[PDB]
Design a protein around this nucleic acid. Structure first.
Ligand SMILES: [Mg+2]
Ligand SMILES: [Mg+2]
Ligand SMILES: [Mg+2]
Ligand SMILES: [Mg+2]
Ligand SMILES: [Mg+2]
Ligand SMILES: [Mg+2]
Ligand SMILES: [Mg+2]
Ligand SMILES: [Mg+2]
Ligand SMILES: [Mg+2]
Ligand SMILES: [Mg+2]
Ligand SMILES: [Mg+2]
Ligand SMILES: [Mg+2]
Ligand SMILES: [Mg+2]
Ligand SMILES: [Mg+2]
Ligand SMILES: [Mg+2]
Ligand SMILES: [Mg+2]
Ligand SMILES: [Mg+2]
Ligand SMILES: [Mg+2]
Ligand SMILES: [Mg+2]
Ligand SMILES: [Mg+2]
Ligand SMILES: [Mg+2]
Ligand SMILES: [Mg+2]
Ligand SMILES: [Mg+2]
Ligand SMILES: [Mg+2]
Ligand SMILES: [Mg+2]
Ligand SMILES: [Mg+2]
Ligand SMILES: [Mg+2]
Ligand SMILES: [Mg+2]
Ligand SMILES: [Mg+2]
Ligand SMILES: [Mg+2]
Ligand SMILES: [Mg+2]
Ligand SMILES: [Mg+2]
Ligand SMILES: [Mg+2]
Ligand SMILES: [Mg+2]
Ligand SMILES: [Mg+2]
Ligand SMILES: [Mg+2]
Ligand SMILES: [Mg+2]
Ligand SMILES: [Mg+2]
Ligand SMILES: [Mg+2]
Ligand SMILES: [Mg+2]
Ligand SMILES: [Mg+2]
Ligand SMILES: [Mg+2]
Ligand SMILES: [Mg+2]
Ligand SMILES: [Mg+2]
Ligand SMILES: [Mg+2]
Ligand SMILES: [Mg+2]
Ligand SMILES: [Mg+2]
Ligand SMILES: [Mg+2]
Ligand SMILES: [Mg+2]
Ligand SMILES: [Mg+2]
Ligand SMILES: [Mg+2]
Ligand SMILES: [Mg+2]
Ligand SMILES: [Mg+2]
Ligand SMILES: [Mg+2]
Ligand SMILES: [Mg+2]
Ligand SMILES: [Mg+2]
Ligand SMILES: [Mg+2]
Ligand SMILES: [Mg+2]
Ligand SMILES: [Mg+2]
Ligand SMILES: [Mg+2]
Ligand SMILES: [Mg+2]
Ligand SMILES: [Mg+2]
Ligand SMILES: [Mg+2]
Ligand SMILES: [Mg+2]
Ligand SMILES: [Mg+2]
Ligand SMILES: [Mg+2]
Ligand SMILES: [Mg+2]
Ligand SMILES: [Mg+2]
Ligand SMILES: [Mg+2]
Ligand SMILES: [Mg+2]
Ligand SMILES: [Mg+2]
Ligand SMILES: [Mg+2]
Ligand SMILES: [Mg+2]
Ligand SMILES: [Mg+2]
Ligand SMILES: [Mg+2]
Ligand SMILES: [Mg+2]
Ligand SMILES: [Mg+2]
Ligand SMILES: [Mg+2]
Ligand SMILES: [Mg+2]
Ligand SMILES: [Mg+2]
Ligand SMILES: [Mg+2]
Ligand SMILES: [Mg+2]
Ligand SMILES: [Mg+2]
Ligand SMILES: [Mg+2]
Ligand SMILES: [Mg+2]
Ligand SMILES: [Mg+2]
Ligand SMILES: [Mg+2]
Ligand SMILES: [Mg+2]
Ligand SMILES: [Mg+2]
Ligand SMILES: [Mg+2]
Ligand SMILES: [Mg+2]
Ligand SMILES: [Mg+2]
Ligand SMILES: [Mg+2]
Ligand SMILES: [Mg+2]
Length: 336
RNA sequence: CCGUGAGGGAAAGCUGAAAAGAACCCCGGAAGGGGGGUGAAAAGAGCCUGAAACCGGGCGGCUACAGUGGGGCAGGCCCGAAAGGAUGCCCCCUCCCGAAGGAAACCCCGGUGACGGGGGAGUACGAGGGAGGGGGUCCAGGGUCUGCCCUUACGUCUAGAAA
RNA sequence: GCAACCCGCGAGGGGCGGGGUCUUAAAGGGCCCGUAGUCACGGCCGUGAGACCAGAAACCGGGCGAUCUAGCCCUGGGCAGGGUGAAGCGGGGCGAAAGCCCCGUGGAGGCCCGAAGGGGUUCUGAUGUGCAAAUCGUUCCCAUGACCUGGGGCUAGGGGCAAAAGACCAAUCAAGCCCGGUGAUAGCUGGUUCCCCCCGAAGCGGGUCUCAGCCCGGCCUCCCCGGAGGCGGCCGGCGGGGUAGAGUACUGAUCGGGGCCCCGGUCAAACUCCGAACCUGCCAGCGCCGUAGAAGGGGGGAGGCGGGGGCGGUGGGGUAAGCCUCCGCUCCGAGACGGGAACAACCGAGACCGGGGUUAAGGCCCCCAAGUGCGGGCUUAGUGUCAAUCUAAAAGGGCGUCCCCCGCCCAAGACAGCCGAGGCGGGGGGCCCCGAAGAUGUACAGGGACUAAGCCCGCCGCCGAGACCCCGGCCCGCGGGCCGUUGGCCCGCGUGGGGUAGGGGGGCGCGGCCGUGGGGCAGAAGCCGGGCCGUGAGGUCCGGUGGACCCGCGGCCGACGAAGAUCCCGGCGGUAGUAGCAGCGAAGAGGGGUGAGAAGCCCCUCCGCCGGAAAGGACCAGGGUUUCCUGGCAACUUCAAUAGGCCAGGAGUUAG
RNA sequence: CGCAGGUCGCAGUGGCAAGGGGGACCUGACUGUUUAACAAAAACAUAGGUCCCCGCGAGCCCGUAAGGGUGUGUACGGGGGC
RNA sequence: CUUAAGGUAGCCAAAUGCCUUGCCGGGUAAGUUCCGGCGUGCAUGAAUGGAUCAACGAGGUCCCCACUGUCCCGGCCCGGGGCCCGGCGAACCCACCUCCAGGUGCACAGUCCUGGGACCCCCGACGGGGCGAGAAGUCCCUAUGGAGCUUCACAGCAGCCUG
RNA sequence: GGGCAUGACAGAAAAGUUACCCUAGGAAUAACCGGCUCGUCGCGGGUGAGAGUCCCCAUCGACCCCGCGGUUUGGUACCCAGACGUCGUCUCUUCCCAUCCUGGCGGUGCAGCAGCCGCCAAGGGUGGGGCUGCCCGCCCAUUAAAGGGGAACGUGAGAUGGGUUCAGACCGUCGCGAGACAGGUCGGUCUCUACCUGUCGGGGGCGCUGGCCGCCUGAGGGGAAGGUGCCCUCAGUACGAGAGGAACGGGGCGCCGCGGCCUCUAGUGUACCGGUUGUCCGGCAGGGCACUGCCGGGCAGCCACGCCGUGGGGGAUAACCGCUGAAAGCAUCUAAGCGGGAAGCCCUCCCCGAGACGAGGCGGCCGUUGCCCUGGGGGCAACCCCGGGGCACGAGGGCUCCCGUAGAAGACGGGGUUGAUGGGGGGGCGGUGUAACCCCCGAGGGUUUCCCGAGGGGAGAGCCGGCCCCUCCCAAUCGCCCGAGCGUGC
């Protein structure tokens, strides 16, 4: 094998490293959360920028407990989501596949939805609810199709993003269906989904970096004593043994960046209602300003400075829950 | 033409009988193109004939879920004027003869049995060879494609070649 | 003589005898003798000649070269700047003096640093189908001298020249180049051109400066003579042998007992009293072959003289080997085809063509034709999945399980601790389990998978080759017959039909010649496609194109047949509208004009580069009209063009 | 060529131009020459040392020969080795 | 004894020491190299020159300081290739042309066997494979093949000496 | 007729050397790899003399024997001489297990701490230096440990070139000599524009049973996405004569790897601002060039030396440990049955994903039509059938246009006048560092003190922004296209 042992360069868990099929994240897994009341299990916001905040450590066992610590934070422009449709899911008896049985739409959708959907001039919402109601006894899941409102964001674009978010919180599918039916045509704010201080998961398409060499894409080492090597140094020496041939595990140049990624257990520091208290006087660089509600998350988030990020309840939460009290943000760097 | 030099040293034939060598008109910057002429024939000065490789277009067949070339059989589409048959070919029916080979039901004897034996029966049938009846139009042959069966480029040394 | 066959003569053939001659004292022996040659045409082979075609490195002869380079000679040119400070020479200080020190002046040197110039170290940089068949960048060495450099001169090939590396002597040097000897030779390597038919090998023995060759025999082929016997099989009569085994008696080893002998025991390729199977000699018979020709002999031509696989000799050697070296049958080579999962030689089996049928090996759950066939038993491990190549397995352990046998106890007082029926111990057999560990990808050995579709003992039917049987067609060998015949046709018989090298027989095609008969402007040759004939080489015809020659038949003659030689010449592809048109320290822009057409030509303005120079002035050799003017863009300039060192026309160089 | 004063910067030989230095061993004294096109060296040469053949009609060498070089020279010399 | 003599002055694990990373010191945290010693030194030694380093060195080697992207370890930027467009427009190589696994076979298969996969086409990049291309392998052997050099090979010829 | 001789004995008369080398060939024949073989080498097992205070087997294992691997060396000579680039290293991927650590278990001559031995187990790790060209080996400081092997002795159309192994040269030894030594030593050209395939990314199209839009599902594929340490408590406790000295459980944090991000810090930043040298533009100002002239700062962006995330669990199991339990009146973890049991396998988790041809589900939009020209056929009376072409209807899609959450080309994303998409203008924020003008001071000199003069001070900053906001002032226009519709059979 190798002359000296060492781990492989890069990961084979993100193979193939191709561009994402969609710029919107497509969440595969949604957790099962018991909150006592029906509620959406996720939210979508726009990544606006990064700051740092002084936060008092609220972990009693932590070695910085009671002290003020500077933490890098991410700001998400989070205007309310407009609930357009409600869809029901059953299980196919032939294979157990989750299959949609039907969906009821609001009768008059907004004009912005016509930019992305071929909709009828008016929906027969009552008839669609009657059609859905006969599938209630076999329903295993219910989700709401929601749309973003980019006019209320700092981007100011008009085309919305449409995605399904499941309704959870209680173990009764009928209560979930009733809550989803009640949500039709209304708007959900981030405070209605999450609470400050809780952990979430973030899913998003990371920043695109275009075609990149093997040194940056996989972290392969430049050839030592770089000037000694004819035909360059930003390369692997060999590209494989004689047998097998070129494998799929061999590092090669290609697309880097624009891939869907999931990051676990990011703590919601704040959920503000007016973005003026968080926007810098110069504004967020390359984004603009925040006027509506915003989410202040701890740490970093995948994606560029305008990407749509999906926050969900955690699927791999730690054993010890965070403190029930809201975290104390003493000062954000955007403030004076 | 090559080498300082002694020396070395190619490629390259063909209008038409007669220039009758293409008048004249339109276009083009021009090479030139269209029309129109000469000539038995463009044989057009890049000049007898004018092959293949090669490239362009038309036509026929295939063409994005199926691994390629060659052969045999069956078929789909296309050609099938002449030089081949059309007294053909194919279908059906009937009749006759028929090599080697050769059943079945059913009845009888035996075996646990798979099966054997007597009769049925050298029977029905059987390569092929003759005769006739009706029905139809092409048949042979060719191009391409598909299905099934078969199939390890050539020349060479070698004990041994797809190597 | 029914014939069978017997008898007589008996050319040719065979033998003896006789004769000529040599040797010898002679005998004996050697050669020769009772008839056929010669000339020619065609063919095959041998030797020489270039000798089927192509191929050396070399060697010799006569000539050419010192524009390169090596050395030296004659006559010119060149080397910024700085530093150090030799001999020599002055002053100052110090001594009683002999005498020391300090400073200056001076300008030596195969001296130092460093431009030009010369050289060529590092990056083992770039390049490496390059800018270039030796370059470029960078870093370096010398740079007043054994220094660098121009012109002229000398030294020439077995010779020169060499501060020496066998360097250099015109991109050529452990002996130049040119032409010639010369088609040098080559046991070696490559190539060697049409068809059908008959037969059909070898890699063995001996000799060889022989081991990649060759000759003599064995093996093949063709022709002839000869004349009736022959032998890969078998029985029998009469013989030979000394292996396997056996023995331990001769020659040797070797373990015990008993008293140098006796007894038991272990061995022998180089031991043998005995001794097979088996092989082999003669005779008789059988079997088969043979007068359509046995034995035997003569002549022509070879190939080949590298073998290989399976099985057997415990062959001999070796740890073993798909190892080395012998012996025998068979098969591959030179043999199709079925099975083996592929596979030259393992099994079956030997193929002219087409069809029908039946079988061989092997198989019959699917892939895949034929059986989820039949009876009994075993296996629980997916063990295993019907010989070998071919992918496996040992000592050892296991009542895991199925079974066979033997010894003992139990006489119901036997094994376990009164109970009541079997218990204990030993040996062996079958299958399976552990022993059992590898490298790209699944219980691998075909895959699916199977609890039988595995294994053992038996059984029944079926499928399945080109083999065997039948039919039709074709061809061959041999014999017979007919025809005026360098040949053609017919018939009969064949347990006739594979075939490389090679031998033998016939035919097709190409160019011409001797004859003979014809076609062609109402369309020859050639070219494109197509039909028909012929096993085939090939022939012939149709339609189109084309525009003057061509063909059938008999005979003869050749510069006579290509798919290949890293073949020769030419044309043309894919690669590919791809590489390159970067690198070496400059570059363009605006407006106008001309013009078919302008980023690029002409003019102005702006911007830039050199400026002891890849760049301004002069000029040698060499080049030779490239100079100037006018016009132009078919070709040339790594793109364009109206531009040009290009093309066309004209002109131009004045000396005491 | 020098002296005094003032003054700015991160940086005053400000760009350009422009030595890293020291110790020890082996080896060849040094400068010089060399395999044009893979070897620049410790290889060659070198001054210095030493030996040999030679008094000239010599020694050594070239030429077939005629003759030639060393030699327009002479042992403080010519030639030949290490 | 001895081929005559038997290595003197010196110098050494040396560019000369096999054993051998010799043994002892120094240097480093760690030293097969290096330096200073030791020497019955395979196989050191005197113009075959010994010892010997002042000066000189594009010589070979070890250490120290300074220095630093050599490296921990990689990042950003600049010019030219690059990529795209317009114009010009080749070459190498080429029997045909090839998805993967495990086998088999002139023993290392694109073409054979048994499997696993693949919708087809186009662009960029690389260099694992095509025992990739270039060059009738210089390494080894054979040939009754060469060339040059050597001498105590077999012969010969000049030259010199002698009668 | 006898002898004189060829012994290489079926009869030439015959020494070396070439690494300066040349030719013709040869896998008939070596060197490397490959093939066959395994003596050798590495590994496993049977046996038990003997040692182990006693005690064969905790730990060894004499004398012998049976095996396995292909990891060293050798044998052979089957392939390859018109050529498979020869050691080591770098770089990068994968596979094996005969396991060095990490997980599980057992034995012990296991009191604890430690150590030794065996079994399962290959998911992860196995590092940094000194010495030698090395491989190997020894050593240093750490560490959980610092395992070993295969892949054409993996990988030179990827590198390097220290070694070996050309031509030069020196030493020692050998040779009369030229020369030779797998003895030492110094020097000594690493060619190729990638045709096919593979791999990694990026595009066009057809198909999915009429076309399309949006949202989903999940067959299957990839994954290491995680691995591993330390400290405190336990506890100076258990254990122990003492010395010494644990563990389960709880709390805290690293290191290695992986995936993101740019708030901070660091780097860069030939956008930008300033200082300054030499020269040219007549001087000031401003500027050219010194290949950003050099120096200092530095927004955005990118980036790491910075920051963030990076888990437990379930199931069947291995080695085995147990329950019940007969065969076999007892006993027995096993035969039937049942319980427990690993960093390993599957799922959970992350990424790709309907070309998943059984080409999927849901909701919606659309088409499911007409007209014109021309050809042929049927019956001619209308008419009808079929071939070709054009036009309209039509959901949806693209090109052109302004851009950037994107980007080699393609693609993707946003906007496109019911518009804030790029520019302009205004404002915000920010970089540099305080322009011009004006006034004050200025070492000293002179036209004495209204002049020169490097320079300091005050007010003023000045310049600039590949960032944010507002504002229709300019330009997102004009235009060019694709597009289902019909029959058939089962
Ligand atoms: Mg290099
Ligand atoms: Mg012509
Ligand atoms: Mg016809
Ligand atoms: Mg006819
Ligand atoms: Mg051969
Ligand atoms: Mg061979
Ligand atoms: Mg042969
Ligand atoms: Mg062949
Ligand atoms: Mg001859
Ligand atoms: Mg000769
Ligand atoms: Mg001569
Ligand atoms: Mg000259
Ligand atoms: Mg000098
Ligand atoms: Mg070099
Ligand atoms: Mg280089
Ligand atoms: Mg190159
Ligand atoms: Mg100098
Ligand atoms: Mg030499
Ligand atoms: Mg010569
Ligand atoms: Mg010649
Ligand atoms: Mg025969
Ligand atoms: Mg041969
Ligand atoms: Mg007998
Ligand atoms: Mg015997
Ligand atoms: Mg015996
Ligand atoms: Mg015998
Ligand atoms: Mg032989
Ligand atoms: Mg044999
Ligand atoms: Mg077979
Ligand atoms: Mg069947
Ligand atoms: Mg055995
Ligand atoms: Mg098995
Ligand atoms: Mg035959
Ligand atoms: Mg004739
Ligand atoms: Mg041929
Ligand atoms: Mg040619
Ligand atoms: Mg071409
Ligand atoms: Mg181009
Ligand atoms: Mg290019
Ligand atoms: Mg300049
Ligand atoms: Mg200038
Ligand atoms: Mg000049
Ligand atoms: Mg001119
Ligand atoms: Mg002119
Ligand atoms: Mg001219
Ligand atoms: Mg400089
Ligand atoms: Mg020197
Ligand atoms: Mg020098
Ligand atoms: Mg050289
Ligand atoms: Mg050199
Ligand atoms: Mg010397
Ligand atoms: Mg001296
Ligand atoms: Mg001497
Ligand atoms: Mg001594
Ligand atoms: Mg040394
Ligand atoms: Mg010594
Ligand atoms: Mg000596
Ligand atoms: Mg000496
Ligand atoms: Mg000596
Ligand atoms: Mg000396
Ligand atoms: Mg010395
Ligand atoms: Mg094999
Ligand atoms: Mg191939
Ligand atoms: Mg050769
Ligand atoms: Mg050669
Ligand atoms: Mg040699
Ligand atoms: Mg010979
Ligand atoms: Mg010669
Ligand atoms: Mg002999
Ligand atoms: Mg061989
Ligand atoms: Mg070998
Ligand atoms: Mg190899
Ligand atoms: Mg062993
Ligand atoms: Mg034991
Ligand atoms: Mg081996
Ligand atoms: Mg081979
Ligand atoms: Mg080869
Ligand atoms: Mg290769
Ligand atoms: Mg090669
Ligand atoms: Mg194991
Ligand atoms: Mg290798
Ligand atoms: Mg290479
Ligand atoms: Mg390679
Ligand atoms: Mg080297
Ligand atoms: Mg050498
Ligand atoms: Mg000597
Ligand atoms: Mg060397
Ligand atoms: Mg390349
Ligand atoms: Mg390419
Ligand atoms: Mg990272
Ligand atoms: Mg800067
Ligand atoms: Mg100024
Ligand atoms: Mg200027
Ligand atoms: Mg500049």
């Amino acid at each position: 094998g190798l002359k000296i042992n060492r781990p492989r360069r890069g990961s084979m868990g993100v193979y193939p490293r191709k561009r994402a099929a969609d710029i919107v994240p497509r969440v595969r897994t949604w957790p099962e959360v018991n909150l006592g009341k029906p509620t959406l299990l996720g939210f979508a916001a726009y990544k606006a920028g990064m700051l740092h905040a002084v936060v008092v450590d609220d972990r009693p066992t932590s070695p910085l407990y009671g002290k003020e610590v500077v933490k890098a934070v991410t700001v998400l422009d989070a205007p309310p989501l407009y609930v357009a449709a409600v869809r029901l899911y059953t299980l196919d008896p032939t294979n157990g596949y989750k299959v949609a049985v039907g969906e009821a739409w609001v009768s008059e959708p907004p004009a912005d939805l016509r930019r992305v959907l071929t909709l009828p001039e008016k929906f027969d919402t009552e008839k669609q609810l009657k059609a859905l109601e006969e599938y209630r006894d076999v329903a295993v899941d219910v989700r709401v199709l929601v749309a973003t409102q980019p006019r209320l964001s700092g981007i100011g674009k008009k085309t919305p993003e449409v995605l399904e978010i499941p309704v959870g919180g209680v173990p009764s599918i009928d209560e979930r269906i009733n809550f989803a039916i009640s949500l039709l045509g209304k708007t959900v704010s981030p405070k209605d989904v999450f609470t400050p201080g809780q952990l979430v998961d973030v899913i998003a398409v990371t920043k695109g970096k275009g075609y990149q060499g093997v040194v940056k894409r996989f972290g392969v080492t430049i050839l030592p004593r770089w000037h000694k090597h004819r035909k360059g140094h930003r390369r692997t020496g060999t590209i494989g043994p004689q047998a097998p041939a070129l494998m799929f595990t061999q590092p090669r140049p290609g697309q880097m960046g624009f891939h869907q990624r999931t990051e676990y257990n990011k703590r919601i520091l704040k959920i503000g209602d007016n973005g003026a208290e968080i926007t810098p006087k110069s504004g967020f660089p390359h984004y603009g300003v925040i006027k509506g509600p915003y989410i202040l998350l701890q740490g970093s988030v995948p994606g560029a400075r305008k990407r749509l990020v999906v926050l969900r309840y955690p699927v791999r939460p730690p054993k010890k829950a965070p403190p029930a009290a809201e975290p104390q943000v003493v000062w954000v760097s955007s403030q004076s």
